[PDB]
Design a protein around this ligand. Structure first.
Ligand code: CLA
Ligand code: CLA
Ligand code: CLA
Ligand code: CLA
Ligand code: CLA
Ligand code: CLA
Ligand code: CLA
Ligand code: LHG
Ligand code: BCR
Ligand code: BCR
Ligand code: PQN
Ligand code: SF4
Ligand code: SF4
Lengths: 37, 141, 733, 30, 75, 138, 39, 80, 75
């Protein structure tokens, strides 16, 4: 995965975040939320 | 009209196929008589006869003759079954006679189907063909 | 306990059912706790604002990824040769083979070829640089921001509208007919005459020379003086090349009524004139209903004055029935939107209006299938909300003896007639298909029932297709319709006749005996889907099996094994069955469209015309023949660019068969299975430590009907999108 | 082609629909 | 059992059944497909179901056309 | 909760952690004759002479046991009492809540759950819109 | 013997006799006049 | 909990109160039928929703209705 | 089946060295191959009066009759 287009480092950092940080954080927050009280 | 379809007599493709029609029956001339029979039809570039269902009487045999024939010999089946079912509803056990068919009555009804369109117009003018909307059971509305 | 805060009855069960039903009930705002009609309408309004922002962010993302990662600069040099790049592939899983296979359309990175046709649409409406798309994407980000702020604003108590504002049908109809359907159409005609037509004729009209360069050498004074013929002075000559000035013409509004001979699409001047006419008609139609001033109509008067002898009450008390019910309004909206999405699909393939989109075949197939699937979904949703209206919002006292009461007063008659017509048509379509199939298999294809679809051929002849030999209205140039004797105003007719009689375009395709049977199969699918949908809509208030279904609601599972067994009696289950039939019918028609156009595009139309009349022709010349390029997307030798489509093909099969799992096996088996698994967890060492807060139960009956339906739908769509997009891109670019 | 800083400009512009979407969804949650 | 009989049919077509030449070499019916194609689902769908149904769907107008009819009837 | 337990060999079907976190149910019956019954948890046990005390995890299991005590034994055991015992300790008394079984009219019970209409005169959901209620309970 | 009469008169026996009779006349008409696509 | 409602059409045939597994129902005295009894649903928080009471009711349409609602531990039949 | 999905994905991703092939990560059925070895070596030691093998499916010679393979070893 080379990037010829502008800001090729940006998918390099945003595919892990949308692939892991967004799911892990969103499911963590929703797991705390749906099971609160 | 109908310039897309040429009659199968003056068609190259149909002649190419009709050189090799198969034999559907034991008879070895069944393919030849089938090629002679389909030569009067209208067929496209593929060489297969097409049917015309406009109701134009030049092609009335394509659809309208089987239409009349089926409507007669299926109104026969409908009217005979209706007349038998109406008849068995006054026999104090109308449900068993659907299981065991009363065959003298059944054959009498089945040979009663010669005159069903006259029976249909008779029962429709005399009100036995249909029932009133209130007289029949129905769902909540 | 806290999660479904909208419904206290779900915040009490200690099971996973509250999680599933919280997700499902979350948007049914009518059933939330503490909900009045005013809070209903205001929450609905701000949800609409959020959804408008979703649409604007989606098209902003499409623009931003065509601009950033796409080859739009390169594609507008030769749109016929270069494939349009959608976005860039970046996943860490790709091997060397996949990276070299997915490097395509002149790129260095692996890229995805765009089959949405946004490149052709952006090229036609005058966008010719990556900076124009970037400005559009940032503008749509700001517009989405504006609509998010508008939604948050209208949740504030100062700006929350009253119930009389939401129940104001006449003013909303005025401002939507005139200000939304007419002013936006007028503004699009303005963009067409100012930006798209001039940049199709060569010159740059950006935001800088927008005011300095008039669209026409004549000013607006000819528009005011009534001498409107100068705007149609010299049309685009038939040797015009798109994007540059050779025989431009400088006429902003013409009505040639044919196709552009180079882009194969419609003339942009013809599009602009169309939108001008539509804007004029929609603007005067928005001055029909009464408002704060005196003139106009009151809809209650119009409806209540339509009373005949054969209906009795007619339309009396239909204004309050439609106005007070949101599911009636949503059913009407979805029905009209499904009809016009079908219309969009049926007109964008025969009358394409984008540059070189009739010569890029995969995007035309994707657009047709996409909009026909959306149209099927919206029509099924229209009938679903008809059923929900009949359950919830229908008052049989106010609707006494009007057209709705008389719909329900004879529902058995029309349900039985839909039953008859669907049975009749299905018996004989399958009978003719099996007859053709059996007599072809017995070596005698001359015995097929091949019926000339003479009625549709006659329709084509009335529109001018002179191939079939009819000379009736427009195929006969001596007729009253073709000459238009009082005025001879047929300015469109020479171009239209030149476009309909050319064998290249998809405009009015040649229809033969193979099209008759598939149109009757499509009619069968439409009738049976309509039968299930109206059998759920009209029996939503109860049949003799269950005379009260209004009190159990829309989507109750069953009514027990009593009364003979009552498994799928709810109106939601008729939605379920008609969802299957909708997917089938759209599969039939998109299969038919796809095979007909694979014949037309390749030029070998004989394949469809002789092989579509029997079912193994459909099976060996379409399903088997055209998946050869698909399943070889990855083979042990290597990988080519149709590898993600082969993977999606198999993926869709897997999702479909998992749907089979949910639809065939039912809840009792799974509940006792989960009971054994629960015993296993509670009695094992080192996993006794971890305990569930929500007790694991099996999915509910209606929930797993929905889940199997979702799997069936998703796998069905993914399989067909993979097949349709890899079969055309296998053989057409 | 397109610039490096236009992408980051688009990101910091789209940070504003992020904030307004968060606040709209929070206000719908009431 | 359908997986069992597909395993059997493909294994014998690729690894057992075939024609032995008088020189002693053996050529199989599907030519050793099972070693490398029977490990992916696409290999079962492409080299077994798609490839070996060319005999059942091209069979029209011949003696094997009853099997094509029965194929479609089962569907 | 007096009574020796039945001579049962133990089973995996039975009391999960629901029994010691929330309610579990005890069925107490008295039989003169020692015999064999089918536990609804799966298996077969031994009815002790005199009083028995069987702890179960669902009320349906207790009533299914009491049903087979009534119908599957020729000397019918009808003096069976079903309790609901809590881990906190207190014991409720559930199935023969009055003196006599629910099929027989005790003449001192109260008609609750009875509507004063048939299903045809049930109100319709359009009248009760956004009322927080549902067409039965109005 | 009135039991064979009432058994030959049942719904399956009579419907199979009827289907066999209609199949017989259809098959015989196809045996003598083989290929009738139209009139 | 599910709500079990008994309507006026009850003929006091006792079929529902012995078809019920959890014995939610019971017969109370009544003056509106020949049998002089009507089913009541006192312990209706123990109703699981099995609808064997509706299955056993002979009167047409139904003199007893179960209206499935807010699930609990008792009304879902969970041993865990 | 997850090995089949893993192979199908690794073949789609152009990583045929990551697959569960015979020319990749290998999962040999060592116990069935051992049993085939024992039955090939059976008619000399553990079945002395058996002249030939119990079947040629375990091992031995390709039995070709009328030019077609009757039975050959199944690897
Ligand atoms: C809903 C529209 C839409 C969709 C379908 C996608 C889809 C995608 N984007 Mg995104 N993107 C969009 C909007 C969209 N984008 C907008 C409006 C912006 C302008 C700021 C960007 C900016 C952008 C960047 C800078 C990158 C992508 C990338 C990606 C890819 C991987 C996802 C990712 O890393 O998320 C990253 C997503 C963001 C940083 C912002 C997305 C915010 C959207 C609007 C949320 C929409 C909410 C939804 C509708 C509910 C994928 C093709 C990556 C890529 O191409 O890798 C190859 C990547 O590097 N996107
Ligand atoms: C959509 C998101 C996505 C993305 C980006 C990835 C990406 C990755 N996958 Mg994954 N995968 C995903 C979805 C995704 N997958 C899903 C949905 C499936 C299930 C079907 C799989 C199944 C799959 C398997 C089974 C395997 C991969 C593996 C791989 C990795 C291959 C290279 C490697 O060895 O990484 C190594 C691992 C990482 C880079 C993970 C990040 C961990 C390091 C330590 C970074 C953390 C930094 C620090 C500790 C914390 C920083 C905090 C921060 C705030 C600064 C690659 C990073 C392979 C692998 O090696 O996985 C480990 C492999 O075996 N994936
Ligand atoms: C002889 C009795 C009888 C007759 C007069 C009718 C007449 C009618 N039926 Mg039919 N029907 C019958 C039998 C009958 N049916 C049976 C046995 C079935 C069960 C499969 C049905 C199921 C059926 C459906 C599901 C529907 C109709 C409908 C209709 C109407 C249109 C005609 C049609 O669609 O035919 C269709 C006929 C069939 C699909 C099956 C016909 C079965 C045989 C051929 C009929 C003869 C039965 C029996 C052998 C006769 C006894 C003969 C006697 C000597 C003992 C019409 C009112 C349609 C409707 O609603 O109208 C608006 C419709 O939707 N019918
Ligand atoms: C002139 C003033 C005006 C304008 C422009 C609008 C505009 C709008 N109103 Mg509003 N409204 C008005 C006054 C106005 N309203 C008044 C005075 C009332 C009070 C009585 C209301 C009360 C009202 C409510 C209660 C609601 C709306 C809603 C909306 C939105 C509905 C349109 C939509 O989302 O799809 C956009 C649709 C179009 C642009 C046209 C439809 C498409 C047609 C069928 C043509 C098809 C397209 C064509 C074939 C080609 C396009 C393809 C191309 C894109 C590629 C839209 C933002 C709803 C909303 O979204 O709230 C936020 C909402 O719930 N309004
Ligand atoms: C204009 C579009 C529109 C609108 C606003 C509504 C709105 C409504 N529908 Mg829907 N509906 C529509 C289109 C529409 N629908 C269409 C096109 C279909 C056919 C597929 C239907 C079929 C239909 C059914 C059969 C039902 C409704 C019901 C509902 C109500 C609750 C929504 C809900 O439970 O979802 C909450 C969200 C979910 C359940 C998530 C599942 C949706 C998919 C699988 C996930 C997609 C998410 C993904 C990220 C994108 C709500 C009034 C339900 C109701 O109770 O009505 C009162 C009901 O039973 N709808
Ligand atoms: C090959 C699959 C197949 C077939 C042939 C049928 C056939 C039919 N469906 Mg359908 N259906 C199917 C799959 C199928 N469906 C699936 C998977 C579902 C999704 C759950 C449904 C759900 C369903 C609904 C919910 C409804 C039907 C109805 C019917 C009838 C539609 C009328 C018609 O087409 O004329 C009849 C055409 C046929 C081809 C009938 C097949 C009989 C053949 C000719 C042989 C009969 C001769 C002898 C008995 C042997 C008919 C019996 C509708 C109905 O009954 O309306 C009256 C109805 O409401 N279907
Ligand atoms: C329900 C639709 C229907 C229709 C309209 C017909 C109509 C006809 N078929 Mg046909 N056919 C049907 C379904 C149907 N078929 C089915 C479902 C099959 C498979 C069993 C057959 C298999 C069949 C054979 C194999 C033959 C006919 C033939 C006939 C023709 C004359 C039959 C006769 O006795 O004289 C007539 C055109 C005969 C003929 O001459 O065809 C031209 C003939 O040889 N059909
Ligand atoms: C051919 C392809 C399309 C076929 C669609 C099939 C629809 C089925 C047609 C059944 C006939 C319906 C009986 C009409 C029901 C009826 O009695 O309507 C009678 C109606 C006259 O009604 P009135 O004008 O008395 O009604 C007062 C108000 O209801 C409206 O003015 O005249 C119609 O025939 C108009 C209906 C045409 C639209 C249908
Ligand atoms: C809401 C609701 C509902 C509804 C829904 C639905 C049912 C829908 C459907 C409907 C539909 C979906 C319809 C359609 C329509 C159609 C039409 C409307 C047609 C017609 C057309 C026209 C008339 C045209 C004509 C023409 C031609 C063809 C050619 C040219 C000329 C002209 C233009 C003349 C219900 C009732 C359920 C219930 C309540 C609620
Ligand atoms: C001619 C023609 C055509 C057309 C057609 C038409 C258009 C028709 C119509 C028709 C119609 C639209 C009809 C309707 C009807 C209605 C009704 C109303 C019916 C009646 C019925 C009934 C009454 C029944 C009875 C019966 C009988 C009669 C017998 C049997 C039994 C029964 C009982 C079933 C076409 C082109 C295709 C082709 C060519 C020719
Ligand atoms: C498999 C199956 C189950 C078992 C299903 C269970 C126990 C839950 C299934 C979900 C598991 C946990 C996997 C979930 C993974 C999915 C990707 C779902 C993600 C969660 C959503 C929010 C998207 C049923 O309970 C059932 C009930 C009625 C009819 C048919 C069936 C049925 O077929
Ligand atoms: S099988 Fe399921 S859906 Fe059918 S009656 Fe029984 S509980 Fe209801
Ligand atoms: S079963 Fe029905 S009729 Fe009989 S007592 Fe119970 S409610 Fe009354």
């Amino acid at each position: 995965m080379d990037g010829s287009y502008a800001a090729s480092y940006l998918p390099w950092i945003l595919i892990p975040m949308v692939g892991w940080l967004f799911p892990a954080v969103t499911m963590g927050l929703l797991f705390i939320h749906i099971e609160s009280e | 009209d109908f310039a897309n379809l040429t009659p199968c007599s003056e068609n190259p493709a149909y002649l190419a196929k009709s050189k090799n029609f198969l034999n559907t029956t034991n008879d070895p001339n069944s393919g030849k008589i089938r090629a002679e029979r389909y030569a009067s039809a209208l067929c496209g570039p593929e060489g297969y006869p097409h049917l015309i269902v406009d109701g134009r009487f030049t092609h009335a045999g394509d659809f309208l003759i089987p239409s009349i024939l089926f409507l007669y010999i299926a109104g026969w089946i409908g009217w005979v079954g209706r007349s038998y079912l109406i008849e068995i509803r006054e026999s104090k056990n109308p449900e068993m006679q659907e299981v065991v068919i009363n065959v003298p009555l059944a054959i009498k009804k089945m040979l009663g189907g010669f005159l069903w369109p006259l029976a249909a117009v008779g029962e429709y003018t005399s009100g036995k063909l249909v029932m009133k909307d209130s007289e029949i059971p129905t769902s909540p509305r | 306990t806290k999660f479904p805060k909208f419904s206290q009855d779900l915040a009490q069960d200690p099971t996973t059912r509250r999680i599933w039903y919280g997700i499902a009930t979350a948007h049914d705002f009518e059933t939330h706790d503490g909900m009045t009609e005013e809070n209903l309408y205001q929450k609905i309004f701000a949800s609409h604002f959020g959804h408008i922002a979703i649409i604007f962010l989606w098209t902003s993302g499409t623009l931003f990824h065509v601009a950033w990662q796409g080859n739009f600069e390169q594609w507008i040099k030769d749109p016929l040769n270069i494939r349009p790049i959608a976005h860039a592939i970046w996943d860490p899983h790709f091997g060397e083979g996949a990276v070299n296979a997915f490097t395509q359309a002149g790129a260095s990175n692996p890229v995805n070829i765009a089959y949405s046709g946004v490149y052709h649409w952006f090229y036609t409406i005058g966008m010719t640089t990556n900076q124009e798309l970037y400005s559009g994407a940032v503008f749509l980000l700001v517009l989405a921001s504006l609509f998010l702020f508008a939604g948050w604003l209208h949740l504030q108590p100062k700006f929350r509208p009253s119930l009389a504002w939401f129940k104001n049908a006449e003013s909303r109809l005025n401002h939507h007919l005139a200000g939304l359907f007419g002013v936006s159409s007028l503004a699009w005609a303005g963009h067409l005459v100012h930006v798209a037509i001039p940049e199709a004729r060569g010159q740059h009209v950006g935001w800088d020379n927008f005011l300095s360069t008039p669209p026409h050498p004549a000013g607006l004074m000819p528009f005011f003086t009534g001498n409107w013929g100068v705007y149609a002075a010299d049309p685009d000559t038939a040797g015009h090349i798109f994007g540059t000035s050779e025989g431009a013409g400088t006429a902003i509004l013409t009505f040639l009524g044919g196709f552009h001979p180079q882009t194969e699409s419609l003339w942009l001047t013809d599009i602009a004139h169309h939108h001008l006419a539509i804007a004029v008609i929609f603007i005067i139609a928005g001055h029909m209903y009464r408002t704060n001033w005196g003139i106009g109509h009151s809809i209650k008067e119009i409806l209540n004055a339509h009373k005949g002898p054969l209906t009795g009450a007619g339309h009396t008390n239909l204004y309050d029935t439609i106005n007070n019910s949101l599911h009636f309004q949503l059913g009407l909206a979805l029905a009209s939107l499904g009809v016009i999405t079908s219309l969009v699909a049926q007109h964008m393939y025969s009358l394409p209006s984008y540059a070189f989109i009739a010569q890029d075949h995969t995007t035309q197939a994707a657009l047709y299938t996409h909009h026909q699937y959306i149209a099927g979904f919206l029509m099924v949703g229209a009938f679903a909300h008809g059923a929900i209206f009949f359950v919830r919002d229908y008052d049989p006292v106010a609707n006494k003896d009007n057209v709705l009461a008389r719909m329900l007063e004879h529902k058995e008659a029309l349900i039985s007639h839909l039953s008859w017509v669907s049975l009749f048509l299905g018996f004989h379509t399958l009978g003719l298909y099996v007859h053709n199939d059996v007599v072809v298999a017995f070596g005698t294809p001359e015995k097929q029932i091949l019926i000339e679809p003479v009625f549709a051929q006659w329709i084509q002849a009335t529109s001018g297709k002179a191939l079939y030999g009819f000379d009736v209205l427009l195929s006969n140039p001596d007729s009253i319709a073709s000459t238009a004797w009082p005025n001879y105003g047929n300015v469109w007719l020479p171009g239209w006749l030149d476009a309909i009689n050319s064998g290249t375009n998809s405009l009015f395709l040649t229809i033969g005996p193979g099209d008759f049977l598939v149109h009757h199969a499509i009619a069968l699918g439409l009738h049976t889907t309509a039968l299930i949908l109206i059998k759920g809509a009209l029996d939503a208030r109860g049949s003799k099996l269950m005379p009260d279904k209004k009190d159990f609601g829309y989507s109750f599972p069953c009514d027990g094994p009593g009364r003979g067994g009552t498994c799928d009696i709810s109106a939601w289950d008729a939605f379920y069955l008609a969802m299957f039939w909708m997917l089938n019918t759209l599969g039939w028609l998109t299969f038919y469209w796809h095979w007909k156009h694979l014949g037309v595009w390749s030029g070998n139309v004989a394949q469809f015309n002789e092989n579509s009349t029997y079912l193994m022709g459909w099976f060996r010349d379409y399903l088997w023949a055209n998946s050869a390029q698909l399943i070889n997307g990855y083979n042990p030798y290597g990988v080519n660019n149709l590898s993600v489509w082969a993977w999606m093909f198999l993926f869709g099969h897997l999702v479909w068969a998992t749907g089979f799992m949910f639809l065939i096996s039912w809840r009792g088996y799974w509940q006792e299975l989960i009971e054994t698994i629960v015993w296993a967890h509670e009695r094992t060492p080192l996993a006794n430590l971890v305990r569930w807060k929500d007790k694991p139960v099996a999915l509910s009956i209606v929930q797993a009907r929905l889940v199997g339906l979702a799997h069936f739908t998703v796998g069905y769509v993914l399989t067909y999108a993979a097949f349709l997009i890899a079969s055309t891109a296998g053989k057409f670019g | 082609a397109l610039s490096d800083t236009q992408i980051l400009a688009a990101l910091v512009v789209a940070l504003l629909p992020a904030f307004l979407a968060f606040r709209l969804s929070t206000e719908l949650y009431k | 059992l359908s997986i069992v009989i597909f395993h059997f049919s493909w294994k014998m077509q690729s690894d057992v059944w075939g024609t032995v030449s008088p020189d002693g070499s053996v050529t199989h019916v599907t030519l050793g497909n099972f070693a490398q194609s029977a490990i992916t689902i696409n290999g079962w769908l492409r080299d077994f179901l798609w490839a070996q149904a060319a005999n059942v769907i091209n069979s029209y107008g011949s003696a094997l056309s009853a099997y094509g009819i029965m194929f479609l009837a089962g569907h | 909760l007096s009574g020796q337990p039945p001579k049962f060999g133990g089973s995996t079907g039975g009391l999960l952690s629901k029994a010691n976190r929330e309610e579990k149910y005890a069925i107490t019956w008295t039989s003169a004759s020692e015999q064999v019954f089918e536990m609804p948890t799966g298996g077969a046990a031994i009815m002790n002479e005199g009083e028995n005390l069987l702890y179960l995890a669902r009320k349906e299991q207790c009533l299914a046991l009491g049903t087979q005590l009534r119908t599957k034994f020729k000397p019918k055991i009808q003096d069976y009492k079903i309790y609901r015992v809590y881990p906190s300790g207190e014991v409720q008394y559930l199935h023969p809540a009055d003196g006599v079984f629910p099929e027989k009219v005790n003449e001192g019970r109260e008609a609750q759950g009875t509507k004063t209409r048939r299903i045809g005169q049930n109100p319709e959901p359009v009248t009760i819109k956004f009322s927080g209620k549902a067409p039965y309970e109005v | 013997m009135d039991g064979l009469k009432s058994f030959l008169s049942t719904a399956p026996v009579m419907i199979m006799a009827l289907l066999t009779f209609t199949a017989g006349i259809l098959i015989e008409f196809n045996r003598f006049y083989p290929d009738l696509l139209f009139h | 909990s599910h709500s079990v409602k008994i309507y006026d059409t009850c003929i006091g045939c006792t079929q529902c109160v012995r078809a019920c597994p959890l014995d939610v129902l019971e017969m109370v005295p009544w003056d509106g039928c020949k049998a002089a009894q009507i089913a009541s649903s006192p312990r209706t928080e123990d109703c699981v929703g099995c609808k064997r009471c509706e299955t056993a009711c002979p009167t047409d349409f139904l003199s007893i209705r179960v209206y499935l609602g807010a699930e609990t531990t008792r009304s879902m039949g969970l041993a865990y | 089946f997850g090995l089949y999905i893993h192979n199908d994905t690794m073949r789609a991703l152009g990583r045929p060295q990551d697959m569960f092939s015979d020319t990749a990560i290998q999962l040999q059925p060592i116990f069935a191959q051992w049993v085939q070895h024992l039955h090939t070596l059976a008619p000399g030691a553990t079945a002395p009066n058996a002249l030939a093998t119990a079947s040629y499916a375990f091992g031995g010679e390709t039995i070709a009759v009328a030019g077609k393979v009757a039975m050959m070893p199944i690897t």
